[PDB]
Assembly symmetry: C11
Homo-oligomer: 69 residues x 11
């Protein structure tokens, strides 16, 4: 299973997991403060991940940055 | 299982999931506001994804950009 | 499973799914307007995909363009 | 499963599927008009694909071009 | 399964499939006229393929040309 | 089997935190690292996300990233 | 499923010979190739070694090799 | 199944195995002296490895060096 | 779907010798090749080691090696 | 299964196998003399290998040298 | 399953197979004379291979030479 690396570039960045299955909703929100790193998998319960705030992102396809505000 | 990365380049980008199976319709529309990133898999319920609006997309195959009206 | 990427370079592009199995026919036609992107897999029900209209297409084998 | 991309370079190109199994015959002819693209897999029912007419073909082994009469 | 691509460089090219199993013979010959392309798999029934005639051949090992 | 991450602690008191796999998300273990220790940690049946706090040098299949403390 | 060998006959009468898989080893088939003909042949339940006699150009996973008459 | 190489740059290096499962504890500590190498797998019982002391370390992602107290 | 070895005989009377898989080790089959013939031989249920006597050009997954008379 | 190459650069190099499982123990020590090569796998019984003495070592991750 | 290529650079080279399992001992010693090539797999019975004497060795990891007494 693939994972995504997320480095928070400011306080209060949110890594949100959406539910796998016929229903789509947020099941969890992980708050990252500046400089913190989260390495997060796709799992049985999480089939999509949303990032809100300024962060540097690595995936198998390369780097992308989310932008706050 | 494969996933796409979607960075909204403007407000109100829509990431639309089409059902796996004999029938084809939309089962969920994730809206993204400017700067937000979504990392989204193909799953048991989603076998085709559609993007409406200005966004920067990465897939196994490289980058593509969606353009809004 | 493999997928194709389709960006509509014009209004009214169709992505057509043909049926998997001993019979071959159209079961669904996804309309795309200019600028819209569809990412679409091969599936239990779709074993061939047809693009009609002006689109930029990426597959595992590279880029190919359909023309109006 | 592998697949092949076929761009029709002229009207009336045919992508023919030959049946898998002990017997070999044509089971379906998809007609393409100039500019239309087909992406078609090898399947339980098709284990060989014939292209008739001028078209641009990509497969895992590269680009090949069919020509008409 | 792997597959072979055959472009007919003249009329009357032959793509011949040999039977898989303890015994060996031709089970189907597919005629290819000049310019026609066949993409053919190895399968439950075909474990070798012979090409007779002038053709352009691609496999996973590269290109090879048959001569008439 | 599954992927792993390399974490070198660039100061004392670095925290490598495992998040629970499954429908609920909580911290189950926090492995503390002092300066210069290396931890090589996998994703597992119990761990489906890892969070790093403090200044550390990180390697994954996607390349290096560095965490920074406050 | 299963490596294959490409054999181009560089003269008439080239022989591609299959050896039997199993505890016992013998020739079970000899496929005659005349000048310019190409044979693409798999390893199989029945054939676990292939011998080429006569002048031919051979491609395998490992490269080209040439047999001499 | 993945493995790490550990070369001890000083006496007393410490390769610590952590238990796989819902509980996390060290279950084995293999000490290395200067110049000794260990090649260790991830296993049914070890899902994380900790290195203490000055060592040179190769994993699939590259070399990393641990530095001691 | 195992590895195979390409052997080209550079002189008459080269010998490709197959050793038995199992607790017991000895030769079960000796294929003689004369100058210029090529043998392409797999590892199999019955052969888990191959020995080449004489002058031949050998290709494997790991590159070319030459056996000498 | 992965394996490792050990060429002893001096007499008396030891390649030690640690047991797979909940318990960790040396179960075999192969002595290598100057210039002898061992190619050894991870197995059902051996899930860690320790090299003691001067040797040149190749693994999937590259070359590393143990020193006496 | 992996294999090793061993070319004898002198007479009396020894390719020695160690037993797979809880016990470790020699079960077969295959002698090579100068110029002979042995291509030998890992197997249900052999999980470690030792070479004595001057040989050129190729594995997945490269070329290593054994030096004889
Ligand atoms: N309990 C969650 C933890 C998690 C993994 N990846 C995530 C991404 C976003 C949010 C939560 C998560 C799960 O197993 O799915
Ligand atoms: N519950 C949906 C969530 C989802 C995943 N990928 C998506 C892409 C588009 C829209 C929704 C989704 C699913 O499991 O499939
Ligand atoms: N419901 C369709 C959706 C789909 C996936 N790929 C397609 C390609 C073309 C048309 C429709 C589709 C299916 O699972 O097959
Ligand atoms: N129903 C057919 C459709 C098809 C797939 N690939 C093809 C190639 C050529 C012609 C038809 C097809 C099938 O599953 O096989
Ligand atoms: N019915 C044949 C079709 C075929 C596939 N590949 C071929 C190559 C040559 C001749 C026929 C074929 C089969 O499944 O095997
Ligand atoms: N050996 C039989 C049956 C057979 C085995 N494999 C085949 C592939 C194709 C056609 C027939 C066969 C025959 O030649 O008739
Ligand atoms: N009936 C033979 C056909 C064949 C395949 N590969 C070959 C190589 C040489 C000679 C014959 C063959 C088989 O399935 O094995
Ligand atoms: N017992 C834990 C060990 C572990 C693995 N990865 C981790 C990451 C962080 C913290 C602990 C761990 C587990 O199997 O999951
Ligand atoms: N019947 C033998 C044929 C063979 C394959 N590879 C070989 C190498 C050497 C000698 C004989 C063989 C087998 O299946 O094993
Ligand atoms: N008995 C331990 C041996 C081991 C493998 N890798 C390790 C890493 C650290 C400590 C011990 C080990 C096991 O199978 O897990
Ligand atoms: N009988 C041992 C032999 C062995 C394999 N790899 C080793 C590494 C070191 C020492 C012994 C071994 C085993 O199968 O595990
Ligand atoms: N019968 C032995 C032959 C063998 C294979 N690899 C070897 C390496 C060394 C010595 C003998 C062998 C076996 O299956 O294991």
């Amino acid at each position: 299973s693939d994972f995504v690396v997320i480095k928070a570039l400011e306080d209060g960045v949110n890594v949100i997991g959406l539910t796998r299955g016929a229903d789509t909703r947020f099941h969890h929100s992980e708050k990252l403060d500046k400089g913190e790193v989260l390495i997060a998998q796709f799992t049985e319960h999480t089939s999509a991940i949303k990032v809100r705030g300024k962060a540097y992102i690595q995936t198998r396809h390369g780097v992308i940055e989310s932008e706050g505000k």
